[PDB]
Structure formats: C-alpha cells, structure tokens
Amino acid sequence: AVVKCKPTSPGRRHVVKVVNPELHKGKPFAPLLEKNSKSGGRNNNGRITTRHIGGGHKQAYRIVDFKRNKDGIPAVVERLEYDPNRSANIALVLYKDGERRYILAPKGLKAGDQIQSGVDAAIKPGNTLPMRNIPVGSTVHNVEMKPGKGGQLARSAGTYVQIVARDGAYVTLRLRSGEMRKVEADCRATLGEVGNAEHMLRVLGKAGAARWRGVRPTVRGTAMNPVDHPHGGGEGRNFGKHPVTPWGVQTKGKKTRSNKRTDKFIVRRRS
Amino acid sequence: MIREERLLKVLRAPHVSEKASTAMEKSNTIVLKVAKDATKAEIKAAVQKLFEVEVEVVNTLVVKGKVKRHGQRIGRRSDWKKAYVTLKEGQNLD
Amino acid sequence: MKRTFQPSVLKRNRSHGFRARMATKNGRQVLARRRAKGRARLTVSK
RNA sequence: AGGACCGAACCGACUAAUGUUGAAAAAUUAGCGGAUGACUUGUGGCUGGGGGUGAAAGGCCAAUCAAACCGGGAGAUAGCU
RNA sequence: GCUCGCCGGAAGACCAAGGGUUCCUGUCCAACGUUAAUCGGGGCAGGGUGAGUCGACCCCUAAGGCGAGGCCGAAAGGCGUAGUCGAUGGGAAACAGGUUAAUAUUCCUGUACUUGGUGUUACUGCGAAGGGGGGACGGAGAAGGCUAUGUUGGCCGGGCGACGGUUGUCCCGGUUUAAGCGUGUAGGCUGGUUUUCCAGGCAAAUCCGGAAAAUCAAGGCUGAGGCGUGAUGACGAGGCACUACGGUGCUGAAGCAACAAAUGCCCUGCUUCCAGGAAAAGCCUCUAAGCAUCAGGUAACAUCAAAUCGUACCCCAAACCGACACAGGUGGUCAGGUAGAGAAUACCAAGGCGCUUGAGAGAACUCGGGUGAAGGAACUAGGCAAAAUGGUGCCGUAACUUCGGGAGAAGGCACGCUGAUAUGUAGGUGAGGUCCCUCGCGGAUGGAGCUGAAAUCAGUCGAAGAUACCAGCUGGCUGCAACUGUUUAUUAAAAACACAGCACUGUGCAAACACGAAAGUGGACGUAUACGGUGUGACGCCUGCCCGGUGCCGGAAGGUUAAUU
C-alpha cells in the first residue's frame, strides 16, 4: 500500500512511498542477473540524444522471460522481487525440471501459485497461451505483436489490454492508450493485469528522488537565450510565439506519426 | 647454455669505488660494469667461465648517466649496467 | 589556484604521442610537416 | 529516519579591510554557507567549434568565447587615420 | 655549543602523481641566491639506486578504444561481429634486527613463505574454447569482542639536589620484540549424511538445479584476538675502553601486571531501508571430444627456476602545477601527552624550523591591534565596520502552524577549590580461592585489585569559577521565493535557474524524438502507471469570459492549382 510520511523535514513532507511487504528482502537470482550500464543519454557518437538522463543509482539487469515458451510444464512461483529496471514487479518462478525464470508479476499472484504456459493451460491469471485460444473479452497483458517475438504491449505496472473481437486470423485489441489494433491471433498473451498497480500512487517528494531515478533537471525553454531555444530571451518574461520543440516544431497538438507501414493494423486512434 | 661469444661480450669492466672495495673485503662481491642487455644468468655463467670462480647469486642495477654541459652545449652520458656479484665462500679474485 | 597544465604522461602519450599520431590520417600529416620542417623532437614522446 | 540541526576536514565564496607597478594576471586576513548528499574527490574515458556542453549566466570549452586555437586564401578589403 | 621563539591532524614522517641527479663526498665564489657568503637545490670532479615475496611487467576484465570479415559512405572515411586492447578494480608469496657518506621489506644475520617445472616412489580416470559454484560487491545504523596505543602500579638502573625542604606515598630513564608455525577462541553463516529418479543447465556430466525416500541434530564453512613457539636470540637504560672528537669497539639489568582504548580488525558480518546496489579470470567441481593402461591426475621427498624494468632524492614543496627559491593549487597513509565531546582549540613530545637584507630612530601619515571619561547610532544611503552573545545541566518558553515545528524561542539559575557522605560512591573491569566439567581459549560462584562519574551538605579564595583559547546577538512587522539545492571561473548568489507537484500535447514499438548523406546508436534491453516536448512551480482556495486575429486539429462538396499528357 501507500504511506505518506510524517513531515519531520522539509522535503520529507510531500513524499509518498509505495511499499510492499512481501517483496523478497535479499539478493536476486544470480544466474538471471546481468550487468547493464548507463548511457547518460548519449549514443555511439557520444552526443546527447535524449536529454535529462544521467546519474542515478547503480542498477543491475534482471533477464525477464517475455517470450515465454516452456509450454505444458507447470511452474510454481518462488517469490516476488523488486526490479529497478522497470515499473512492475517480477516473479522468480520455478519449473518442474528445475529451470528458474523471471516473469512479470501478474496482479493476483503470490508465492506458491501455479503457472502454465501454452496452449492447453488453464485460464487463470499468470497463464500464457495464444489469443486465438484466449476467449474474447478477457483482460490480458504482456502481449506479443509478432508471433514468437515476445511481449511488447502492456508491461508497466498497473496496465492491461482488452480483447474486443476475433475475426479469423486476427484479433482486435483495445490498448491502454485507447487505440484499437488488429494483431495476428497466434500471438501470445499472459492473462490478467500487470501487478504493481498502485505504482502511480507514489509521489516523489523532492528533487533528490528524481535524481536517484536518474533524471537530470529540465530547463524550460523560455528561460534561455534565443541562440539556445526558439523560445529564448527577452526582457522580463516574454513568449510571444507558438510553442515548439528546441528544434522548432510544434508541440501542442501537432501529430507526428508518419509510419505508413503499420497503418493497416490501426483500427482506431486514441482520443 | 650460453654462447662463448656472448660470455666474452658481457663483462666490460670491474668497477672501482669505496663501496666496491668495502663490499669486496666484507661481503665477498665484485662489482662489474657489464653490458646493458646482459641478464643475471648471462653474468653468472660468464664470470663462472671466465674467472673460474664459484658465485652465489648476482644482483644487477642500471646506472643512469648524468646530464652535463660542455661549455654551453648540453650533453648526456650513457646509461650502463652495474652488477653486484657475490661469490661462494673462500673464492678469491684478483 | 589550479592552473591549466596538470600533467600526466599517460594522458600525454595517449593524446599527442607517436602511435596516436600514427593511427589517423591527419596525424600522419602532422608528422609529415614536422619532418619536412626538420623538427628535432618529432612528437611529444621521450 | 532525514536532500534534519550545530560544527572540523572538505567543498564553496556573502560582507568588510588590505592589496591594485600585489606575496598572487582574483589572493590574504577577520567573520560567512553547505558539511550523508541534487555531496565531494582521485584515476582513466567520451562529447569538437555554427559544434559540444550548460539546475540557463550567452556561462564554459587550456589566463582567449554573441562562435576557441593553429596554419592557409591573404599583401582580404579599408571612400578612414 | 648554550639559551630564546615557532609548528606539532603540521611548518612532522611516509607513498601515488609529477619532476629527473636536485641525493652523498671533495672542491670553487666569476654568474645564480632579491644583501654578504667560507654556504647552497649554484659551478666543477668523483660516487651512490642491488628484490622470486615491493611495484611495474604478466593473467583477468569495466568505461571506452581499435577492429578480420561485414554494413554503409564521392574519395578520405563512419559504424561494428569475431576478437584484441584498455586500471582507477580482481589474481601467489617476508618479516625482525644490523649495516653505507649516500641504498635497502632489495645488502648481511636469523627465521619463513609462494608458484612452476624436472626427477623419484606410492596411488589411479585424466582431459574444455563448454556446464555449474565461487570470485561477487549498496546506503545508513547499532552494539559486542578485540587490538594498535596510552596511563598507572610493579620491577630494574641511576640520583639525593646551585636556594627553604626532599631516604621517600621521592625524582629521572627503561620496561621492546615481527612474519611464519601450532592451537582454534569471541563471533557469524549453514541442518548434515545416504539412496533413487528427472521435460532443466545448447552435447554430455557422478557437478549444479529440482523431486522423492531413509537416518542423525550434530556436522561443515568462516573467523578477529589471546596463548605457545619463533626468541637461551636480537634489542635494551646505561656503563667500560679508544678516539680521524666525527664517533668506534666491548659489556649490558629489568624486560611484568592492571586499567583505559580507537574512526583500525572481527565486519565482504549483523540489523534496517529503498534509490535495489560491476565484469571476467585465478580458484573448486563436472563431464565433452580424445586417450588407454600410456599420457595425465595428487602425495611426500629431492632438485632447479622465479627472468626483465623501476628502486637515489623532492612529494602539501626552494625540486610538482603557478614566468620567480612566488603568502596560491596538489590525491592517499600514519595520528603521542595534558585539558577538551572532538582530527576544534591551547600548550607540548617525537620530529622539524626561525620564513636569505640587516642596523638604528621611535615625526606626520598608512596598515594590523589594545584601551577609553560622559553620551550611546546623534554617524551613515544603510549599525558598513566594530562592539556585543557564546558551554554544560536544570527551570521555563508566545503568536501562528502543514501539528513536524516555531524553539537553543525568549528569559533565568548552578558552575572554582577542599573535606564529608564515600580513607573512591553509583557504575565499569575483574585475579585468586572454591565447585562442576562431555576438559578447555570451558561453565558457575567469588570478589582481591584497578578504574571511576554524577549529586548533596559543609567550608574556603578572588572583583570575577563556562575565568585563557574556543564558543548563537535577540525580538516585532513586511515584500519576494515553498523548502535543501544551482548560477555569470575573474565586479551580480538573487526575487534569476532547478525542483517535487500540476496541466496540455505528441508517441502502439522497427514508436515519437535526437545524433547521423548512410549504416548505426540513444530513447530502451523500457512498452501509454512508459517516454519526449512545452508551460507552471510545494501546499490551501481557486483558475472567470472571448475561437474575431495568428497557430494547431478535423472534414473534403465546390473554387484555385505543379510536374506530367
């Protein structure tokens, strides 16, 4: 659940922790760790591409099975773990032949619960199977877009996707954006919602928590000199111009999706 | 086993100093200006051939040459290799 | 006051040293110009 | 417990005086802020000039910055001195 | 040489970087040194740096670089796979004493250790580019056990006082000893052992992982420190003989206990938190190919090897970076006594210095200070600067409030020394003795001894007891910004920027956007509870009307309309 904390300093005052008691107090599964190192927002040319990234706490990478494959072997959930990589929680889970794997944690779920992947498997939250075998009207999550590729839709921490219609080789998804999308129906999905659903119910409290999450501060554009932004400069607070990106194209309203390849799949846009 | 040309190449000189004479009279070591590429086994085998003496062990060091000025014109002496060679006991050397 | 030259010979040989010049095309064209001028010290390197 | 308090190292530079051909091409002295953090620091790397980088002052990028430095066009041009 | 003064968490000692002979000795004073100069980091000559164990090198990898092929690019070239480099991180091993003018964990003495061959003999499944384990990791907090170390007593040696007293509860000095080896302790972690099976670990695997079944809770791992040995040794106050007055040679007592005690060790621990905390190798183990009674594997022993390079000296500076023998900058390590909470500060030890012009005189005036009648901000743009407050314990403490604060609010009281309580108390530590004991580095009791606050009462001194150094000025109203932060290196630290929070908007993933002629990369190994851009800036109450204008979004009936034909 949430807590507010008592305001026994400034900048403790407005904080909300999301705490979860049953997340596993101790070190994660050291096969399925690996290293990931930080970009600082900088590509292989070393220029900053995506600004306002840097710093923050050192993070390892949990390798998480989205692709999700061990079909008709039952597994049982060992434990739930924090993941610093991603907004949801993960589950360390244990198959009958003694592979352990990391999954996303679905919403109901706890230690000792039984999961099964693939086509037979019983339609409980956690289970994964093709969505020609999902019955229509289910909430599912961690959703393949191409078959075999792995779960790309609804991963973060309180979301899920609606299955609206199935016409032959395709199903139709109501996404979390409120898009409607045709996806080929031999894609996999996992039942139920993704777990840590009060994740938005945090608030951060101070600048330091944003810095530990590795977010360098954002200078807004009208502060600058007009060499630096389009918005820049002017005596006192002036801004007699239409609001743009720093490379000078419109940001309130103007649509940017250009991809004519995928446009047969988009049934309806968001609104 | 090291070639006779190389063994005759290695030793340049005995070195004369107070520290040379005191180490000779006390701890039974000679000191040699040797070749600057000469290794410890080369020095040991060379002196064991070439003064027919028994040696314990050899320590080397590199001397770095000083920087001088012959009048105005600046100038550097050569580096060279300096070998502390202790003999086995009751070996004399001339 | 921390002045600008703050030496270390690893950084010096990595930045202006001989193989650093010799790796790239214009860095050779440094060494072409310094030979053709006739410099006694070619690179920075001891 | 804490971007908590007081306060050394450390980091910084708010006030005054001196200094202004200085001990110093920005410091000393007396006080001053932070001092477990958005801290500070060593070593190495990466980002190159209409470019970088910037908790944004047009700041900084080798005592140089409303476009670094070096060489070249180049003896630019100069109705001006 | 005798005094004096200064530093002493440094102005001492040691490393890394950086420098490059500045180190030591002889010799010289032309130049250099802000003066003289016999002196020197100056000139000239000679000497001086010794390693299996220190470091580099080497093995391993991070960021990152290069990059066979490959992809892309007018050319140049860009990116990148296999790889191969790249420490600032991981990986084997030496300490004590002595020695030179200058080196020493390198040389000498004593005592060890590590890794590789080789060769024996004993034994018999060896083998990897692969599997598994391990290496292997955060912040904060908390004690407990210790140690470095210090203090006191004991012991040993010396002393009996320049001037009153000082054979004593007197003064001074010393009271040191490592690595290794053996023991395995406080502690911490973990249930072990056997048997069977198995969709997993790219193939295999006796190894791991997972399922069973049986048996015993006592077995394994780790581990400071102590103890014994090292050590009948070395060292050792001092003495005794010579003297190149520099020092040399010889001899050499005591060498214990108690208490205190780290920020060092156990501790890569434990507890807690969220912001969830490198890799690879050495190492352990498994088997694959292969071999085959060989090779190899491990065991003791014997023997050989451990190359090369650096090693002087400066290192918070006269030797490095600042043009200077420059009030500057410069990372890490050691951390004594008294008082003190303290690495503050004061005086000191060890140690090191007196800052490379002196000598007078004692005008104005300048600078740094001390004090001041009476007044107390009248000065002034402005209490600028000065002055003033300052510690600990206890009492007490307002408006307002987001209930946390405000608040150390304000303000006041006690403070030294001596005695008694109490020949030193509460407390801490804890020997003998005794008992138990599966027997020890054991468990009880027992308190010797040592250390030791805090308070009360009484007395006493001074003008003054937080006496020096050190060490908040306080209150009221109000503008602005919520706050901690950030900023114009070198005239601006703010109301400027940032910020948590909010709102709009874009973006369905080969996303949007950005750097890129492109490949490619960031975003992100993330997936609308996510990311980017814009504006606003905690929180409370809110956020009214206008779409005419300019943008933006949607529509496509008509008008206008390019290349093309």
Numbering used by the authors:
A (entry chain B): 2 to 272
B (entry chain T): 1 to 94
C (entry chain d): 1 to 46
Sentences from the paper on this structure:
Bacterial ribosomes frequently stall at the 3′ end of mRNAs lacking an in-frame stop codon due to physical or nucleolytic damage to the mRNA or premature termination of transcription. These “non-stop” ribosomes must be rescued to maintain protein synthesis capacity and cell viability. All bacterial species that have been studied use trans-translation as the primary ribosome rescue pathway. We previously reported the discovery of a family of acylaminooxadiazoles that selectively inhibit trans-translation, the main ribosome rescue pathway in bacteria.
To understand the mechanism of the acylaminooxadiazole antibiotics, we used cryogenic electron microscopy (cryo-EM) to determine the structure of KKL-2098 cross-linked to a non-stop ribosome. KKL-2098 was added to the culture, UV radiation was used to stimulate cross-linking between KKL-2098 and the ribosomes, and the non-stop ribosomes were affinity-purified, vitrified, and visualized by cryo-EM. 474,382 particles were collected and classified to isolate the 70S ribosomes containing a P-site tRNA, and the structure was solved to 3.1 Å resolution. Inspection of the map revealed density consistent with KKL-2098 near residue C2452 in the PTC, a 23S rRNA nucleotide shown to crosslink with KKL-2098 in E. coli. C KKL-2098 is positioned close to the peptidyl transferase center adjacent to 23S rRNA A2602, C2452, U2506, and U2585 and the CCA end of the P-site tRNA. Third, in this orientation N3 of the oxadiazole, which allowed no substitutions, is adjacent to A2602, positioned to make hydrogen-bonding or dipole interactions that require the 1,3,4 oxadiazole configuration (note that this oxadiazole configuration has a strong dipole moment). Other molecular interactions between KKL-2098 and the ribosome include the amide oxygen in Zone 3 with the 3′ end of the terminal A76 from the P-site tRNA. The position of KKL-2098 would clash with tmRNA in the A site, partially overlapping with the phosphate of the terminal adenine, suggesting that the acylaminooxadiazoles may inhibit trans-translation in part either by preventing tmRNA-SmpB binding at the A site or by interfering with tmRNA-SmpB translocation from the A to the P site. D The N terminus of bL27 (purple) moves 180° to pack against ribosomal protein uL16 and the acceptor arm of the P-site tRNA. In contrast, the presence of KKL-2098 in the non-stop ribosome stabilizes bL27 in the rotated conformation away from the PTC.
